[PDB]
Design a protein around this nucleic acid. Sequence first.
DNA 1: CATCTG
DNA 2: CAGATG
Length: 327
Amino acid sequence: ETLNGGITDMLTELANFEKNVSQAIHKYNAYRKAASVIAKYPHKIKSGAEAKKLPGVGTKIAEKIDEFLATGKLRKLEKIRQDDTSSSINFLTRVSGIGPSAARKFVDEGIKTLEDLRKNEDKLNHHQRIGLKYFGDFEKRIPREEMLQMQDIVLNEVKKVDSEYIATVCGSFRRGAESSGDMDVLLTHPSFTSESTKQPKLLHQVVEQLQKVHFITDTLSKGETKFMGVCQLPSKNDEKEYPHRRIDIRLIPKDQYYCGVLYFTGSDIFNKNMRAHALEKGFTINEYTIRPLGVTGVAGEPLPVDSEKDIFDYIQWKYREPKDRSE
DNA sequence: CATCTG
DNA sequence: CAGATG
Ligand code: NA
Ligand code: NA
Protein backbone atom coordinates (compact mmCIF):
# COMPACT_ATOMS: atom_id res chain seq x y z
CA GLU A 1 0.00 0.00 0.00
CA THR A 2 3.02 2.27 0.43
CA LEU A 3 5.98 -0.04 0.44
CA ASN A 4 5.62 -1.27 -3.08
CA GLY A 5 4.09 1.97 -4.49
CA GLY A 6 6.39 3.42 -7.11
CA ILE A 7 6.79 -0.07 -8.46
CA THR A 8 3.25 -0.77 -8.65
CA ASP A 9 2.91 2.63 -10.14
CA MET A 10 5.41 2.59 -13.02
CA LEU A 11 3.93 -0.77 -13.93
CA THR A 12 0.51 0.84 -14.18
CA GLU A 13 2.03 3.48 -16.53
CA LEU A 14 3.63 0.70 -18.51
CA ALA A 15 0.44 -1.25 -18.42
CA ASN A 16 -1.47 1.75 -19.62
CA PHE A 17 0.65 2.63 -22.54
CA GLU A 18 0.59 -0.86 -23.98
CA LYS A 19 -3.12 -0.80 -24.21
CA ASN A 20 -3.59 2.85 -25.15
CA VAL A 21 -0.61 3.63 -27.54
CA SER A 22 0.31 0.17 -28.56
CA GLN A 23 -2.38 -2.26 -28.56
CA ALA A 24 -0.47 -4.87 -26.59
CA ILE A 25 -3.38 -6.15 -24.70
CA HIS A 26 -1.14 -9.06 -23.73
CA LYS A 27 1.69 -6.88 -22.51
CA TYR A 28 -0.83 -4.61 -20.94
CA ASN A 29 -2.71 -7.37 -19.14
CA ALA A 30 0.67 -8.47 -18.11
CA TYR A 31 1.76 -5.41 -15.97
CA ARG A 32 -1.55 -5.36 -14.57
CA LYS A 33 -1.45 -8.77 -12.85
CA ALA A 34 2.07 -7.82 -11.86
CA ALA A 35 1.38 -4.51 -10.21
CA SER A 36 -1.53 -6.38 -8.74
CA VAL A 37 0.81 -8.97 -7.14
CA ILE A 38 3.73 -6.79 -6.09
CA ALA A 39 0.74 -4.97 -4.60
CA LYS A 40 -0.31 -7.57 -2.06
CA TYR A 41 3.36 -8.28 -1.25
CA PRO A 42 4.20 -7.86 2.34
CA HIS A 43 7.68 -6.84 1.93
CA LYS A 44 9.82 -4.27 0.70
CA ILE A 45 10.98 -5.45 -2.66
CA LYS A 46 14.57 -4.51 -2.72
CA SER A 47 15.43 -6.19 -6.06
CA GLY A 48 14.22 -7.52 -9.34
CA ALA A 49 15.43 -10.89 -8.47
CA GLU A 50 13.43 -10.64 -5.29
CA ALA A 51 10.34 -9.85 -7.24
CA LYS A 52 10.75 -12.29 -10.04
CA LYS A 53 10.12 -14.85 -7.38
CA LEU A 54 6.56 -13.67 -7.65
CA PRO A 55 3.93 -14.92 -10.15
CA GLY A 56 3.22 -12.66 -13.18
CA VAL A 57 6.65 -11.59 -12.56
CA GLY A 58 9.04 -12.38 -15.12
CA THR A 59 12.34 -11.48 -16.51
CA LYS A 60 11.29 -8.36 -18.43
CA ILE A 61 9.32 -6.90 -15.61
CA ALA A 62 12.15 -7.91 -13.28
CA GLU A 63 14.66 -6.07 -15.41
CA LYS A 64 12.47 -2.96 -15.12
CA ILE A 65 12.22 -2.84 -11.42
CA ASP A 66 15.90 -3.20 -11.09
CA GLU A 67 16.43 -0.10 -13.20
CA PHE A 68 13.82 1.82 -11.32
CA LEU A 69 15.18 0.74 -7.97
CA ALA A 70 18.69 1.21 -9.26
CA THR A 71 18.07 4.71 -10.59
CA GLY A 72 15.22 7.06 -9.71
CA LYS A 73 13.79 6.50 -13.13
CA LEU A 74 12.98 4.31 -16.18
CA ARG A 75 14.23 5.22 -19.66
CA LYS A 76 11.20 3.59 -21.35
CA LEU A 77 8.91 5.61 -19.15
CA GLU A 78 10.85 8.83 -19.65
CA LYS A 79 10.74 8.20 -23.37
CA ILE A 80 6.87 7.83 -23.41
CA ARG A 81 6.25 11.07 -21.34
CA GLN A 82 7.90 12.92 -24.12
CA ASP A 83 6.40 11.23 -27.13
CA ASP A 84 3.79 13.55 -28.36
CA THR A 85 1.89 10.83 -30.12
CA SER A 86 1.58 8.98 -26.99
CA SER A 87 0.76 12.22 -25.34
CA SER A 88 -1.85 12.98 -27.88
CA ILE A 89 -3.41 9.59 -27.67
CA ASN A 90 -3.94 10.29 -23.97
CA PHE A 91 -5.25 13.72 -24.59
CA LEU A 92 -7.90 12.89 -27.12
CA THR A 93 -9.33 10.12 -25.08
CA ARG A 94 -10.31 12.86 -22.57
CA VAL A 95 -13.21 13.48 -24.81
CA SER A 96 -16.46 11.70 -24.46
CA GLY A 97 -17.01 9.25 -27.31
CA ILE A 98 -13.42 9.20 -27.98
CA GLY A 99 -11.93 5.95 -27.07
CA PRO A 100 -8.29 5.05 -27.94
CA SER A 101 -9.19 3.17 -31.07
CA ALA A 102 -10.59 6.31 -32.23
CA ALA A 103 -7.67 8.14 -30.64
CA ARG A 104 -5.01 6.71 -32.98
CA LYS A 105 -7.00 7.21 -36.12
CA PHE A 106 -7.37 10.90 -35.48
CA VAL A 107 -3.79 11.17 -34.63
CA ASP A 108 -2.67 9.42 -37.62
CA GLU A 109 -4.84 11.69 -39.38
CA GLY A 110 -2.74 14.28 -37.74
CA ILE A 111 -5.59 15.62 -35.46
CA LYS A 112 -4.20 15.95 -32.13
CA THR A 113 -5.37 18.93 -30.38
CA LEU A 114 -8.68 20.48 -29.39
CA GLU A 115 -8.38 22.83 -32.18
CA ASP A 116 -7.69 19.97 -34.38
CA LEU A 117 -10.82 18.34 -33.23
CA ARG A 118 -12.90 21.41 -33.88
CA LYS A 119 -11.64 21.90 -37.46
CA ASN A 120 -12.52 18.41 -38.31
CA GLU A 121 -15.69 18.50 -36.43
CA ASP A 122 -17.11 16.55 -39.27
CA LYS A 123 -15.01 13.57 -38.50
CA LEU A 124 -16.61 13.22 -35.07
CA ASN A 125 -19.80 11.41 -34.49
CA HIS A 126 -22.82 12.64 -32.56
CA HIS A 127 -21.71 11.72 -29.07
CA GLN A 128 -18.18 12.73 -30.06
CA ARG A 129 -19.63 16.01 -30.84
CA ILE A 130 -21.46 16.80 -27.63
CA GLY A 131 -18.26 15.55 -26.00
CA LEU A 132 -16.17 18.20 -27.59
CA LYS A 133 -18.84 20.73 -27.17
CA TYR A 134 -18.85 20.20 -23.44
CA PHE A 135 -15.19 19.38 -22.78
CA GLY A 136 -14.84 21.81 -19.91
CA ASP A 137 -18.33 21.24 -18.31
CA PHE A 138 -17.55 17.59 -18.46
CA GLU A 139 -14.30 17.67 -16.69
CA LYS A 140 -16.06 19.65 -13.88
CA ARG A 141 -17.06 17.91 -10.66
CA ILE A 142 -20.65 18.11 -9.61
CA PRO A 143 -21.05 19.66 -6.08
CA ARG A 144 -24.02 18.54 -3.77
CA GLU A 145 -25.69 21.87 -3.81
CA GLU A 146 -26.44 21.28 -7.57
CA MET A 147 -26.74 17.63 -6.95
CA LEU A 148 -29.63 17.81 -4.46
CA GLN A 149 -31.19 20.60 -6.71
CA MET A 150 -31.21 18.30 -9.86
CA GLN A 151 -32.33 15.45 -7.82
CA ASP A 152 -35.32 17.48 -6.68
CA ILE A 153 -36.20 18.16 -10.27
CA VAL A 154 -35.88 14.77 -11.76
CA LEU A 155 -37.60 13.38 -8.80
CA ASN A 156 -40.39 15.87 -9.09
CA GLU A 157 -41.13 15.47 -12.77
CA VAL A 158 -41.04 11.73 -12.72
CA LYS A 159 -43.64 12.08 -10.18
CA LYS A 160 -45.77 14.11 -12.44
CA VAL A 161 -45.74 11.53 -15.18
CA ASP A 162 -46.73 8.58 -13.08
CA SER A 163 -47.20 7.91 -9.44
CA GLU A 164 -45.76 4.46 -9.69
CA TYR A 165 -42.29 5.61 -10.74
CA ILE A 166 -39.37 4.89 -8.35
CA ALA A 167 -36.43 7.10 -9.06
CA THR A 168 -33.32 6.85 -7.05
CA VAL A 169 -30.23 8.87 -7.46
CA CYS A 170 -27.62 6.37 -6.34
CA GLY A 171 -23.84 6.82 -6.69
CA SER A 172 -21.46 8.44 -4.22
CA PHE A 173 -24.23 11.14 -4.05
CA ARG A 174 -26.12 8.41 -2.15
CA ARG A 175 -23.04 7.79 0.02
CA GLY A 176 -23.05 11.44 1.16
CA ALA A 177 -20.15 12.41 -1.19
CA GLU A 178 -19.49 16.13 -1.29
CA SER A 179 -19.17 16.15 -5.09
CA SER A 180 -20.03 13.87 -7.87
CA GLY A 181 -18.95 13.28 -11.43
CA ASP A 182 -22.37 12.63 -12.88
CA MET A 183 -25.96 11.85 -12.06
CA ASP A 184 -26.75 8.18 -11.92
CA VAL A 185 -30.48 7.57 -11.74
CA LEU A 186 -32.07 4.14 -11.00
CA LEU A 187 -35.47 3.65 -12.25
CA THR A 188 -38.38 1.30 -11.93
CA HIS A 189 -42.03 1.00 -12.03
CA PRO A 190 -44.43 -1.80 -10.85
CA SER A 191 -45.63 -2.61 -14.16
CA PHE A 192 -42.07 -3.74 -14.86
CA THR A 193 -40.46 -6.96 -13.99
CA SER A 194 -38.45 -10.12 -14.60
CA GLU A 195 -41.14 -11.70 -16.84
CA SER A 196 -43.28 -8.57 -17.50
CA THR A 197 -42.87 -8.48 -21.31
CA LYS A 198 -41.14 -5.23 -22.12
CA GLN A 199 -42.41 -1.68 -21.87
CA PRO A 200 -39.88 0.86 -23.23
CA LYS A 201 -42.36 3.64 -22.97
CA LEU A 202 -41.68 3.34 -19.27
CA LEU A 203 -38.27 4.81 -19.81
CA HIS A 204 -39.10 6.99 -22.79
CA GLN A 205 -41.91 8.93 -21.18
CA VAL A 206 -39.86 10.42 -18.46
CA VAL A 207 -37.13 11.28 -20.89
CA GLU A 208 -39.32 13.37 -22.95
CA GLN A 209 -40.55 15.18 -19.87
CA LEU A 210 -37.07 16.19 -18.67
CA GLN A 211 -36.27 17.62 -22.01
CA LYS A 212 -39.83 18.93 -21.86
CA VAL A 213 -39.17 21.10 -18.97
CA HIS A 214 -35.51 21.44 -20.28
CA PHE A 215 -33.61 19.62 -17.61
CA ILE A 216 -32.02 17.60 -20.32
CA THR A 217 -29.95 19.12 -23.05
CA ASP A 218 -28.77 16.46 -25.49
CA THR A 219 -29.04 12.65 -26.08
CA LEU A 220 -25.90 10.38 -25.95
CA SER A 221 -27.68 7.34 -26.23
CA LYS A 222 -31.25 6.33 -25.99
CA GLY A 223 -32.08 2.69 -25.82
CA GLU A 224 -35.03 0.86 -24.52
CA THR A 225 -33.63 0.69 -21.00
CA LYS A 226 -30.80 3.07 -20.68
CA PHE A 227 -30.71 6.61 -21.71
CA MET A 228 -27.35 8.52 -21.73
CA GLY A 229 -27.48 12.22 -21.76
CA VAL A 230 -26.80 15.82 -20.66
CA CYS A 231 -28.64 18.15 -18.32
CA GLN A 232 -28.77 21.52 -16.81
CA LEU A 233 -29.81 23.69 -13.98
CA PRO A 234 -31.99 26.40 -15.16
CA SER A 235 -29.89 29.49 -14.96
CA LYS A 236 -32.02 31.38 -12.41
CA ASN A 237 -31.77 34.99 -13.23
CA ASP A 238 -29.02 35.44 -15.82
CA GLU A 239 -25.42 36.07 -14.76
CA LYS A 240 -24.47 32.50 -13.81
CA GLU A 241 -25.41 29.57 -16.04
CA TYR A 242 -24.73 25.97 -15.15
CA PRO A 243 -22.23 23.50 -16.47
CA HIS A 244 -23.61 20.81 -18.44
CA ARG A 245 -23.86 17.58 -16.62
CA ARG A 246 -23.59 13.93 -17.47
CA ILE A 247 -26.82 12.13 -16.80
CA ASP A 248 -27.74 8.52 -16.96
CA ILE A 249 -31.22 7.07 -16.60
CA ARG A 250 -31.82 3.34 -16.41
CA LEU A 251 -34.89 1.35 -16.37
CA ILE A 252 -34.99 -1.92 -14.31
CA PRO A 253 -37.82 -4.29 -13.60
CA LYS A 254 -39.22 -3.83 -10.15
CA ASP A 255 -38.34 -7.48 -9.32
CA GLN A 256 -34.58 -6.52 -9.05
CA TYR A 257 -34.39 -2.82 -8.01
CA TYR A 258 -32.98 -2.94 -4.51
CA CYS A 259 -29.98 -4.96 -5.60
CA GLY A 260 -29.12 -2.68 -8.45
CA VAL A 261 -30.13 -0.22 -6.07
CA LEU A 262 -27.69 -1.52 -3.48
CA TYR A 263 -25.04 -2.16 -5.88
CA PHE A 264 -25.13 1.01 -7.80
CA THR A 265 -24.49 2.95 -4.59
CA GLY A 266 -21.50 0.90 -3.50
CA SER A 267 -18.85 1.47 -2.79
CA ASP A 268 -17.04 -1.25 -4.69
CA ILE A 269 -15.52 -2.27 -1.43
CA PHE A 270 -18.76 -2.29 0.54
CA ASN A 271 -19.95 -4.63 -2.12
CA LYS A 272 -17.14 -7.07 -2.05
CA ASN A 273 -17.30 -7.27 1.71
CA MET A 274 -21.01 -7.69 1.83
CA ARG A 275 -20.52 -9.89 -1.23
CA ALA A 276 -17.96 -11.79 0.71
CA HIS A 277 -20.11 -12.15 3.75
CA ALA A 278 -23.28 -13.08 1.75
CA LEU A 279 -21.17 -16.04 0.63
CA GLU A 280 -20.66 -16.91 4.17
CA LYS A 281 -24.28 -16.84 5.20
CA GLY A 282 -24.99 -19.32 2.27
CA PHE A 283 -26.01 -16.82 -0.49
CA THR A 284 -25.07 -14.84 -3.52
CA ILE A 285 -25.37 -11.34 -4.68
CA ASN A 286 -24.67 -9.54 -7.89
CA GLU A 287 -26.26 -6.68 -9.47
CA TYR A 288 -29.78 -8.24 -10.04
CA THR A 289 -30.50 -10.62 -7.19
CA ILE A 290 -29.58 -12.59 -4.15
CA ARG A 291 -29.87 -16.32 -4.32
CA PRO A 292 -29.71 -19.06 -1.77
CA LEU A 293 -26.54 -20.94 -2.32
CA GLY A 294 -27.06 -24.67 -2.21
CA VAL A 295 -24.30 -26.95 -1.11
CA THR A 296 -23.99 -29.00 -4.33
CA GLY A 297 -21.33 -26.54 -5.31
CA VAL A 298 -23.53 -23.80 -6.20
CA ALA A 299 -27.21 -23.38 -6.72
CA GLY A 300 -29.91 -20.71 -6.95
CA GLU A 301 -33.47 -19.43 -7.32
CA PRO A 302 -34.62 -16.00 -6.63
CA LEU A 303 -35.08 -14.39 -3.37
CA PRO A 304 -37.81 -11.85 -2.89
CA VAL A 305 -36.66 -8.27 -2.06
CA ASP A 306 -38.86 -5.35 -1.00
CA SER A 307 -35.95 -3.07 0.01
CA GLU A 308 -32.20 -2.82 0.87
CA LYS A 309 -33.23 -3.92 4.34
CA ASP A 310 -34.51 -7.08 2.81
CA ILE A 311 -31.11 -7.92 1.31
CA PHE A 312 -28.95 -7.36 4.37
CA ASP A 313 -31.65 -9.18 6.33
CA TYR A 314 -30.88 -12.29 4.39
CA ILE A 315 -27.23 -12.06 4.99
CA GLN A 316 -28.03 -11.53 8.65
CA TRP A 317 -26.32 -8.23 8.85
CA LYS A 318 -26.50 -4.65 10.28
CA TYR A 319 -28.55 -2.34 8.09
CA ARG A 320 -26.06 0.31 7.17
CA GLU A 321 -27.07 3.74 6.10
CA PRO A 322 -25.88 4.57 2.65
CA LYS A 323 -23.61 6.99 4.34
CA ASP A 324 -21.66 4.16 6.20
CA ARG A 325 -21.35 2.04 3.03
CA SER A 326 -17.95 3.49 2.51
CA GLU A 327 -16.12 0.27 3.38
C1' DC B 1 -23.76 -4.76 -20.74
C1' DA B 2 -26.39 -1.76 -23.71
C1' DT B 3 -26.04 1.20 -27.77
C1' DC B 4 -24.19 3.14 -31.83
C1' DT B 5 -21.95 3.23 -36.37
C1' DG B 6 -20.85 2.02 -40.47
C1' DC C 1 -22.75 -7.95 -38.23
C1' DA C 2 -17.85 -6.99 -35.56
C1' DG C 3 -16.38 -3.54 -32.80
C1' DA C 4 -16.14 0.89 -30.04
C1' DT C 5 -17.53 3.42 -26.26
C1' DG C 6 -19.39 4.27 -21.63
NA1 NA D 1 -12.96 9.29 -23.94
NA1 NA E 1 -11.79 -11.47 -34.09
